[model samples]
Target chain A: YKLVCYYTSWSQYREGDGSCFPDALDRFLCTHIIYSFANISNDHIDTWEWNDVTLYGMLNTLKNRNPNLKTLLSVGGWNFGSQRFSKIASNTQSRRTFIKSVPPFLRTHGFDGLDLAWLYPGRRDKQHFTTLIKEMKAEFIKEAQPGKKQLLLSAALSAGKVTIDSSYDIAKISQHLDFISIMTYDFHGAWRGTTGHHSPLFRGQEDASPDRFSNTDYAVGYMLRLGAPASKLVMGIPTFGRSFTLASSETGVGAPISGPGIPGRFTKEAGTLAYYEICDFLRGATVHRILGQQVPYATKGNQWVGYDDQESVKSKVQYLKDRQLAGAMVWALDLDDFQGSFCGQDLRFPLTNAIKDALAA
Target chain B: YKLVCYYTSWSQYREGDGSCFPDALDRFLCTHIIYSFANISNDHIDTWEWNDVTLYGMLNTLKNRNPNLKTLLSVGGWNFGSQRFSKIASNTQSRRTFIKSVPPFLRTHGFDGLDLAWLYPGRRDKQHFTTLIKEMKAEFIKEAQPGKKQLLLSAALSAGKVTIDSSYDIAKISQHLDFISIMTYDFHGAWRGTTGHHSPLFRGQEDASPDRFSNTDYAVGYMLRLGAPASKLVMGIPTFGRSFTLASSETGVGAPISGPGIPGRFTKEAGTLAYYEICDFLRGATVHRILGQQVPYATKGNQWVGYDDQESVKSKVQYLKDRQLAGAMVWALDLDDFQGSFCGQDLRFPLTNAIKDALAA
Candidate 1:
């Protein structure tokens, strides 16, 4: 299994520097380190800022410590939106322009490849998306030389069935790219008007959804049925939690939710909490395991969190292996307790370490 | 990994009756046994003859010997065709009739469940097939009683891309199945002008086929992409060898083939040899490991046999474990040297035993 972990550029800007910086990442843990959210303009890929160039250089330098680790410059993310991608993918000239612009930047940075984190694609953008990949594949193949390995091209795909069926030609996309990581988490959130496990390994029997497609199995199954090769499919795991405000004292999966819950002390984002904070949340809360779902939850007062722990991460790792998937990917590394200080006195990367152990086992 | 082996009823009729009888099968090695070719006639399922009642009785009696073993009545095969299945699956009444007819038969016969081996369906048969499975699922669920294991349901599916896309509502089929055994072998034969390994684990770069879909990776990848859960997908391993007559002095993968090679001494099939004969073929033959294909082949003079030996079977078991697939399945147990007579002295079930060891490891 190829363990692909994401290192977000914004993590460096956190209140205190966590141990998850470019220099602090354990090179031995992951096969591939994807530097997240390098912005994409009309035809060029840019770093988060000028300092990011230095960071990208530092990220590449990790190869000196672990030569087996491959680095990829991930372009675009949720914050980048989809219109720019829609525009760039639709036009042949723009596709060629972006294709021409990428290899040099990757090569200059000593990166092995590029990762397209285009948040998502729309129905009309299917052929355009295929065209973009086709163009990228052609250019990647065209620039191959005798001594250097070819650049790897991968995409972060939406796990939603609607987006998958509309935004991509699965077979063609699979044929063109080296691999694809499906964002398999976040099936439910505060937006759903109810409390639910965000990353349930199995759909709970109590789940009343019409199709039960909101679980990991269904999401991954949709991708597979659409024509992705298991070898090229990487299942994504979240290093954060989707928190919600319980409607009343009763709290469990399927409990009524008032709205989004409060933000974390450090990783302050409304309705969301990092895994480190989740660890903190676990300290005082009473955790409950929902029957048949194969996932656990915790609640203290009205705050409810449905997130992965070391146990759930282990399940996800085994699930990845069970599905014959390429490997598991952490959404972002900084969200976890990278420093071993906040979550507990002894644990650092409790979840990621569990993933590493399970994959190796 | 669960080892599922096919026990073909017709094999008992083969010359000399190799060590493959229901009583002779090493139940300890396999978790499940699928009794092959229980013909589906309209809405009814029938055994080969009335005496097949005795055969089925004997098959079930083996459970008394090994209480942990599971047995499924496999209905349909290559000769069974898809017409009857299409007819049965198309109508709600026929679907209900067949669904109603199965459980009691299974229960009375001391069988665990039913395996639909429809050979394959066409593009238009997709919904009908889904309807059939959905109906079966509904009944299977409804019939479950306290303390009784829910009846297992599975199918033997074609691995070709076109067949998969047109024939399956992949996601829905996955939801209803316990597991789907992919017919991952018989990729190439004398039908093609060249001699090729039938079930190469990885596609060889030397392959000249326009599309690499014929290889095991491509076929399995196609299934994974289309929405088959890896846990519910079993990789099929051939217990027989695909033999080819050499058209030239040189014999290797992609070499020219004139026609089918000579028949097996006991099995008496043209262009094919049992694993036992393949073992005999390997005694003095020069074997060449096909680079990148992850499989070995033997060739001498005009005879070329591409088959899985204990070594290759170990590789395949590792492939299954690595992929995290449900487990591996063998096509017709009779083909293997079950009695330790042909392959080598005291080498009973050399291939299956290798699979057992690798999976256990």
Candidate 2:
């Protein structure tokens, strides 16, 4: 089985030295992707008032300007989709309105097909999502078939409980779909009150039960059980983490937020900081894990949350294959330490060997 | 992070290949993607014609066109929402009325975007999910942030219970939508049964609690979390499964489906079959986990269900990361043998390793 890699950020894109770049590619001889994240949105594409075509140009550059390199239009990100899906998907009439507005959308900017990233169509309206897709598909099929033009359809999915229970139907659903993008990460983090693996293949010791309900087992296996095929699902990784803070003798899922839970930070200047930022400050140091899930505690004061390192990611990728999954996905590209000379050299870490090992295995 | 691959069904483009052919560009560096699945949409650019161009032209000669390589897409997927997303998305008010006027609401066709096939919006939505994602995001943010676009959106979602909740969100709907896809795989095959690791990741071991889960994790973790990131969510993967038929009276989760499961007659003619199919036909086929569920299922039989073999796919995962993704969307791009050989040559399977090695980090 071939491994799949998913990346979204650009900062890390330019950072990879030729060594890291070629090394990673060499391990697997891989080539494929979706890029230009958060780049094309309502305001970002329409009324930017000022245009930095460089972004579009960058996409072209990345593709080696190859028509073969497929890059779809991925709209709506975490902060991007506020309240739009419900409006346009109401009915055929609204769909028409949508068509009138979107045609120019593609022409104005350069993109191949479209990728939908709606967080919860079902969450907003159980009745509207199906209707909207029906309408959109009609439009897409008619135009693209035997065509002079082509457009793609794809979406991003949740990696939690709500989706499987409320938003998906695999069997009848597979008919109209070409592919599904399943997000299989974000199982544990500061969000869970612990510094754990973002995505683990094997059930970890911290697993609540012996049933092997770990993220890896659950994410890949669950989809398979639900009728979602392995080729359709993709494993997700994080450039950043869901962070938290630790207080003295931390215990329980919710313990007064333990000082304060904070967003993880990454930069050449600050390096990689996680939930334990304050503790790191107090202890005059930082902690990172090369061994998956190995927590580093500070003795100067109390406890702390650690950040993910190459080892953890390596494990996650292997986890993908372990479950016979489709592939692996990283949160963003720019978040990594690209420059070897930079303090956050971890960002520039080359994972070729690690991934190769996983794939080879 | 690894290279990301985006699949834009060449058959569904609005402007076939959409300005992608400019000779001075190489787009594959950023992502290695190709159009294959979730491309059932009827959308075609008024500006371009499908017959005039081909997906093969966009991908097969990519090395000559852009030099980097990747390819993917599903046939029918989520955004086909109810089997008619394209129809409804493209139908003008008059068109809808005409369809209503028809005796059986005979479905006609129009084209707009590529395919977004998440066909089973509901558990029994056998043929009504045509209203899936033609636009992009589930929630449309008009704030016009740094990255926004007027283009259509799309994605592939799960057919899990959560997806069933709001199979149709009509508000922010297809405004930004292009298409939505669905994922179909990992039914009760191998990996978890009293017998073997059938679809290993989903169901729990017999000794474990009934609460155990598997591939269901794919949909829950990534898709729903986006809350309608876009309508184009495409179906992820297909054409493979966890082998399970191999189990004899002695086989267990630790057994090999191929070794024990009699090798079913595999055919290059049908493209790829579902996991369950392999279970029934393969000789003693049964899914097994050898590495305590870290890796599973071995068989004296020659065939295995750990599908997806291709280098192009490896980079596809990384592309998701570089783009600040909703997630990676993929199809059962399984025209090759499990070992990564197609048309009598090596096709490079499990694209993930290559992605990890190729990506900047």
Candidate 3:
């Protein structure tokens, strides 16, 4: 079991003293810290963010602070999307190109592994994903030598039932990967017509969201049933909440939503609120803790945000521990109360710490 | 990832220098050395062998040679049966009695953990087992303190689908078990109508299991698909071969078998021969290897035996590695040529060593 945290490149560009840079991270917090993301070009891994090399240097330097830390570079994301990965993994030439490029990119960057966030397979890409993983891992094992450890390989997985069924042959792929990070959040968001919690621990009896499968428990169990071994399954925990702009005064969960919620003052993203922003929102807001869901939602006039708190994160921690999973992962540290200035209030990365402490049991 | 060898009590009672004693163990050979069968007497764990106390001491005393070695005491076996286990766990009081007896006995014996081999838990014992494991692991976790590592829990599981489906709440109990040793051998014997290999790598088109779920691949895949953790799965390899007597001229796999084959001269046990005996048997017997099944069976005048050799053992080790399993376990160290006199040929534990070397990659 481990705590894996992600560091997104654009967080360093955020306004206010709110910018979350590689130098601004808590080195000892996570066992493995990943830098998202490098990109696919020339059918190989390439830099996506400007000054990413500089950021990668700073991130790797955290090893000086915490000697046991592991660093990995992610090769894709939702924004970079799926088409290019399809092109890269479609055939032998490009698959070999991508697989061949991984080692030098990872090793030269002072990183320990590769985390693929290809997002994701539909139908044709399924077998392609399997062979791609097998080929890459064969090289990883073949190239291992006396002095250094073999490079690790992992991937971000779909949590949706439909996406998971279409996207993975998890058991086959699991053999080649070191970790399986299931994207267990974003279950409910602005896309759904109703206002509901984004990451509930359990499904509602009368689930009125887009689907009943939008919960942490369902996704984890579904993966296990699909043959993903429990020890390699890393449950995803979101530090940011999904927000909705209410259509009327009916602000409780299942209320109709007009559109995406107003953008956060700091994150500058509509339909999402960081933990720190949620802290601030809670002061003048009417908070409703969904005991059955093991999460809570708060409403400030027409802005309805649903997310996790200490209780929710602790519940998820218990859920993962009980499921005997590998660990819990935070999508990005930049989205949390990273600076100890807001909700951190003498405690930085509160929910992360809560997960860590809860997992200790 | 590891080599776990079981130490059976009666092996010390064998005739001649064939006696296998604790002092004879090469401590470094196995990561974990388990002492099998401490029966359920008085509804609590009790000594089965008269000299068990003396033996347990010597077993744990092996730590002096390899301090990292882990020793566990198994509470049941086939001879002990399921009826007694059911009686003990059928009620909370007896369950508590058995659970409470564990820590004190293990701690006193200098053992690190408990391995439940309550052989073939049935439909009724299934829920009892779930609660038993949950309760036992709960206490195991609760008892950990400043210096001591928490007590470990593991179980030997039934590999057949019928028993597996009725006998396990695998995904649920998996949370509490540190290891799930799937007994992949014992698929064929005199009880079966025909001659067949006991532990085949893959199911044959015409299996002698009376069913298809009797091969190593099916057992492992069944457990995983039922939610067993890959990292905790320990593959069981038999150090002894199961034999049968020829009933007719067919005398090949699927041939008619009259009854159990003649016992080994030294072992004096029906239908089974240790590797050392097989080495002797091979000099006169005609051997036939099944490539698709990845195991071999030999036949003499009226004797037929299905067993593994160094090559077969190596293949199993590779299989476990590809499955990314926790380890490989030998049924008994005593069954191997511990004296290095017969098959040892200047090298002791040849089969065990082959498995160790093959798992290195």
Candidate 4:
């Protein structure tokens, strides 16, 4: 099982003690560390973070300390609008411009692979995406010398069935990719106009048709049904949670919400909570289990959130095993209890550690 | 122990064989049958339907059939709007103009009482509603001659705690009204972006703070907590269901919807279905129960509907007894299977009959 963890490059600038630098990362915990996210500049890949070049150097330094560890550079995130991605994938020269830069960037930065997260591409963009992947794979193979290792290629995919049917020629992509990291969380968030777990393991009775396709299990199964190799399907587990400000003080999952939840002092993101923030909220707040969905939500006053804990992490790890999938990938390592001072566990990277340990079982 | 039932004046216009008329009513079912709704025209109550006068004569004939039965004339429905009510309540002379018309209207129509359904009133209108109630109650008291009985005064109310706080000064209105009928069923509707049952009995773990205030139990509990007399609290039970067109075929309680659902063959209303229509759909649809909320929902293709069945009705009746509510109120009589055709029950008014039967227990 590959325990892949992502590191948010911007976490270094987080306010107070929450700032996470690349050197703070644990080398032995993950088989791979993916640094997110590089920018899609014009027709070539570029660094969004000013210190990304320095950060990449520090992150890859761990590979030598833990000899089995691999590092990748992830490009594109939700905030990075897919318009430019569509621009680069639309033409042959533009695709070539982006493709040629990949190997050199990975080699220069000491990374072994590249992770593409082209959000939700449209119909034309879908074909373009396939072309881009195919061209990249071809170039990657030709550039490889027998003495040197070939660079790994993976892409983050959507969890929505509608998105799946329209955005992917999965069988085609399955032939070229090393791993398929399906971003299953954020199924429900502030934009949804109501509260729900971003990543539910199973559909509860509360989940009805059409909505049934929005769970983790459904996304994984649908991907497999559409020809994703189980070994290449890396199920994503969030180290953070979705938060909401209740319209009232009656905290239930689908309660009407006033708006995004108050920001965490650390993450500083409204509508989202780092696992450590959730841990702080858990100290006195009432917590309830959504047994059918295999997730837990906690509430305090008018704030509500759905998140994963150690037990749910273990449950999800077993789910990966049950499905005979390769392993689990955490969205980012910094979002968890990286400093380990918050949760009752009192151990750093509790959720990440749980996934690794559970997968071993 | 009044079991008040509503008779939608428009049910007689339902398509095909679904037309329901007053003569079809069972004599012993309800303590009162409220003819909805008399119109608020200028300073006085008026009949919205050209045949409303004739319908009143036919409805009150039930009173002669069952001597214990009372008939009330309700004015103002959701479609009627509350602006005219505010207009009539703005001045004492206008109030008297409307007030003086009430007794004569009831006397000529053979009705025993009046049920005020002002919808939701704003701050200024809230005071206006209170003044209107006070004036009507006074007129009703004075209109009582030595040989004539004093006419009963009641009002339909909002089930929302926020609405309750904003719409009424409970103790003031409680003093004048004979019953407080909380219309709790439409707590969730098509206007809501996500699918949820309109009339859930209790909060599931999925219900967060503000949304926790939206269930039947919370509405009743909040009303009592705010000085509503338990003896005068008549909780509403809907005889119709809110339907949704699933954005996808995955039907869960909070699933995304395209918009209003396909109209039923009979009710001919988008985003809604009569209980009889629901019964027809149930023949082959896969139904699931929201156990925490004590309701059942069914799906057929892209359509999903949350409606009460005999079991939920029985549960609601027990809840009524447990909460020491005055009694139950059915939103409309004709929506249920007055024809005795659909559903496995093979009995007319199955949900209503269940409520009546369970109340006796």
The TM-score of candidate 3 is 0.54
Q: List the candidate 2 regions with Cα displacement exceeding 4 Å.
A: A1-30, A36-52, A65-68, A99-104, A122-124, A134-138, A147-150, A172-175, A189-197, A206-214, A249-303, A340-361, B1-361
The TM-score of candidate 1 is 0.54
Model 4, A29-61: lDDT tens digits are 988889889987777788998888888888988
lDDT of each: 0.82, 0.41, 0.85, 0.85
Lowest lDDT block of 10, candidate 3 chain B: B204-213
Interface RMSD of each: 5.8, 8.5, 5.5, 27.6
Please, what are the lDDT tens digits per residue for candidate 4 over residues B152-207?
99999989776776678675688799998998887753235777787888877564
DockQ of every candidate: 0.12, 0.02, 0.06, 0.01
Show the lowest summed lDDT stretch of 10 residues, model 2 chain B.
B103-112
Proportion of true inter-chain contacts also present in candidate 3: 0.09
Q: Report the C-alpha lDDT of model 3 over B1-361, residue by residue, as the tens digit.
A: 7688899988898898679888888888899988998988777778899999999999988999688899999989989978878888878899998888888888888889999998878788887888999999987887776557998898988887778877788877887899988889988857767898889989865644456677899999878766677998999998889999898878778899888889998789898999888888988899888867889999989899999988899989888898899999898788887887787487787778778788875
lDDT of 1 by residue, B128-211 (tens): 888888888777777786567889999988877768867887766887899999989888857778888888888777435535
Question: Which CAPRI tier for candidate 2?
Answer: incorrect
TM-score on B-chain, cand. 4: 0.96
Model 2, B272-323: lDDT tens per residue?
3333234344445454444333334434443434433233234333433443
Candidate 4 ranges with C-alpha deviation above 4 Å: A207-210, B1-361
Please give, for residues A293-320, the per-residue lDDT of candidate 1 as tens digits: 6778889999998888888888888888
Q: Assign candidate 3 its CAPRI class.
A: incorrect
N/CA/C clash count, model 1: 12
**TM-score for chain A, prediction 2:** 0.69
**Candidate 4: CAPRI quality band:** incorrect
Per-residue lDDT over A1-361 for candidate 3, one digit per residue giving the tens place of the 0 to 100 score? 7899989998888788568889888888899999998997887788898899999999999999798899999888888868778878887899898889888888888999899898987778988998988998887777676566999898999898878766677767988899999988888532357787878888865545556688889999878766678989999999999898999878777888988789888988899888888888888898889766889899998899998888889989899998899999997688888887787368888888888788887
DockQ of 1: 0.12
- Model 2 lDDT vs. the true structure? 0.41
TM-score of chain A of 3: 0.96
